[PDB]
């Protein structure tokens, strides 16, 4: 297989074809929403999305090359981060709104419905606008997400780390490639490459906060018994 062998275009296509669908929120509860009401929704969504992410992860070049224990870990650290970059990417053309699902577009105010939820919302929205402010192309979007999957749990786990780095390098040449073809200069390319990666820093930060927030909702009992999503949350205490 080896992803370090396929060419840039083969990498981007591999990542686009691997993309997961845009699932739907449960229909009917329309609006408005009680803290319980809204939380059951986002977790039910996240829960069904996890199943698609797990299967997406395997389609990412070089991932299935890692040992099971390592694939399990990587997804345990980045699952929320990855869910968030998707939401942010889907919200792109929805200034002031966060498109959790086509049938579930939320604006800042509704974030006030769930305690301590609004704060996160502002961060997500700021990143959404940041991506639009930057005209993030989908080709770049798929790279960034693949990078998160590999770079989040890599220093928490030596030949395994080595692979992850060899791959992350290919995703960076490929990312640079995408910018080169868009006519950007060298300076603008490494300039843009830095801008995109620096955002992965807030995506980590927002994830940490959300992770701590989700955990807080479990202690209140507003979070349904979503086993897959629970295990994921649990990987951050164990």
């Amino acid at each position: 297989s080896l992803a370090l062998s396929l060419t840039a275009d083969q990498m981007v296509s591999a990542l686009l074809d691997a993309e997961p669908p845009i699932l739907y929120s449960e229909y009917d509860p329309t609006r408005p929403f009680s803290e319980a009401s809204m939380m059951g929704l986002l977790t039910n969504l996240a829960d069904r999305e996890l199943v698609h992410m797990i299967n997406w992860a395997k389609r990412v070049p070089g991932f299935v090359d890692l040992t099971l224990h390592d694939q399990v870990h990587l997804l345990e650290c980045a699952w929320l981060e990855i869910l968030m970059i998707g939401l942010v990417w889907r919200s792109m053309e929805h200034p002031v709104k966060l498109l959790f699902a086509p049938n579930l577009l939320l604006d800042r105010n509704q974030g006030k419905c769930v305690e301590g939820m609004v704060e996160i919302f502002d961060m997500l929205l700021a990143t959404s606008s940041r991506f639009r402010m930057m005209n993030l192309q989908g080709e770049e979007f798929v790279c960034l997400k693949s990078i998160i999957l590999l770079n989040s749990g890599v220093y928490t786990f030596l030949e395994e780390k080595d692979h992850i780095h060899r791959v992350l390098d290919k995703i960076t040449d490929t990312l640079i490639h995408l910018m080169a073809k868009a006519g950007l200069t060298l300076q603008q390319q490494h300039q843009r490459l830095a801008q995109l990666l620096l955002i992965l820093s807030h995506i980590r930060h927002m994830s940490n906060k959300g992770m701590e927030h989700l955990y807080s909702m479990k202690c209140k009992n507003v979070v349904p018994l979503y086993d897959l999503l629970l295990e994921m949350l649990d990987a951050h205490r164990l």
Partner: peptide
């Protein structure tokens, strides 16, 4: 922790 494990193997 099995759910995540099982799903990663369906191969």
């Amino acid at each position: 922790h099995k759910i995540l494990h099982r799903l990663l193997q369906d191969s």
